[PDB]
Amino acid sequence: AQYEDGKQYTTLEKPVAGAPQVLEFFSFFCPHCYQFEEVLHISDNVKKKLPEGVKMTKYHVNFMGGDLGKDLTQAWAVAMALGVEDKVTVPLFEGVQKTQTIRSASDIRDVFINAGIKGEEYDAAWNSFVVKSLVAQQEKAAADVQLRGVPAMFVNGKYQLNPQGMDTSNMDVFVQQYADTVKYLSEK
Ligand SMILES: COc1cccc(-c2ccc3c(CC(=O)O)c(-c4cccc(OC)c4)oc3c2)c1
């Protein structure tokens, strides 16, 4: 076959019931995640190949960057709670990996202030139980699939993307292979 379990994707031995359709994990400390988001725009090319109005879900993970990595997961919860993902994804990646000016929770917050989120709004969300459950949801989702590496994408709790079995001589070909596989998997 042209798509085979073990090549473009792997199949989970313990399926995850009731999982989100397209579920993507990343870390703002992850160099490959910087690439997927800044250079390759994986998330966005995937969305463009799925049925309109499908649920793409993206979660931060804790297992990179120690204390600040956990801070970043709470800020991703804030971002999600306020719907400002599109405003802070780029500054956050660049602050962690490009300028390396994100060294503390205060520096994370600066990204939001600079992005135009009011301090009161940020601090209120940061400290809210809505954000605390949304941290919990990100952690639970990662736990369900026993996630030890990012970037990572899962379709319907059954299929994991295997980008190691795809061609990287061309950034655009790689992306489309990736997006086409997600689409094929979502139709299975
Ligand atoms: C051509 O355009 C570009 C521009 C920038 C980067 C890339 C690129 C190339 C290869 C890989 C691989 C794996 C491999 O060695 O094949 C991974 C990856 C993904 C998720 C988890 C993981 O950990 C096991 C590894 O990400 C990649 C990105 C391509």
UniProtKB/Swiss-Prot annotation:
<dbReference type="Pfam" id="PF01323">
    <property type="entry name" value="DSBA"/>
</dbReference>
<dbReference type="GO" id="GO:0071236">
    <property type="term" value="P:cellular response to antibiotic"/>
</dbReference>
<comment type="function">
    <text>Required for disulfide bond formation in some periplasmic proteins such as PhoA or OmpA. Acts by transferring its disulfide bond to other proteins and is reduced in the process. DsbA is reoxidized by DsbB. Required for pilus biogenesis. PhoP-regulated transcription is redox-sensitive, being activated when the periplasm becomes more reducing (deletion of dsbA/dsbB, treatment with dithiothreitol). MgrB acts between DsbA/DsbB and PhoP/PhoQ in this pathway.</text>
</comment>
<dbReference type="GO" id="GO:0030288">
    <property type="term" value="C:outer membrane-bounded periplasmic space"/>
</dbReference>
<keyword id="KW-1015">Disulfide bond</keyword>
<protein>
    <recommendedName>
        <fullName>Thiol:disulfide interchange protein DsbA</fullName>
    </recommendedName>
</protein>
<dbReference type="GO" id="GO:0015035">
    <property type="term" value="F:protein-disulfide reductase activity"/>
</dbReference>
<keyword id="KW-0676">Redox-active center</keyword>
<dbReference type="InterPro" id="IPR036249">
    <property type="entry name" value="Thioredoxin-like_sf"/>
</dbReference>
<dbReference type="InterPro" id="IPR023205">
    <property type="entry name" value="DsbA/DsbL"/>
</dbReference>
<dbReference type="InterPro" id="IPR013766">
    <property type="entry name" value="Thioredoxin_domain"/>
</dbReference>
<dbReference type="GO" id="GO:0003756">
    <property type="term" value="F:protein disulfide isomerase activity"/>
</dbReference>
<dbReference type="InterPro" id="IPR017937">
    <property type="entry name" value="Thioredoxin_CS"/>
</dbReference>
<comment type="similarity">
    <text>Belongs to the thioredoxin family. DsbA subfamily.</text>
</comment>
<keyword id="KW-0574">Periplasm</keyword>
<feature type="disulfide bond" description="Redox-active">
    <location>
        <begin position="30"/>
        <end position="33"/>
    </location>
</feature>
<dbReference type="InterPro" id="IPR050824">
    <property type="entry name" value="Thiol_disulfide_DsbA"/>
</dbReference>
<dbReference type="InterPro" id="IPR001853">
    <property type="entry name" value="DSBA-like_thioredoxin_dom"/>
</dbReference>
<keyword id="KW-0732">Signal</keyword>
<feature type="domain" description="Thioredoxin">
    <location>
        <begin position="1"/>
        <end position="131"/>
    </location>
</feature>
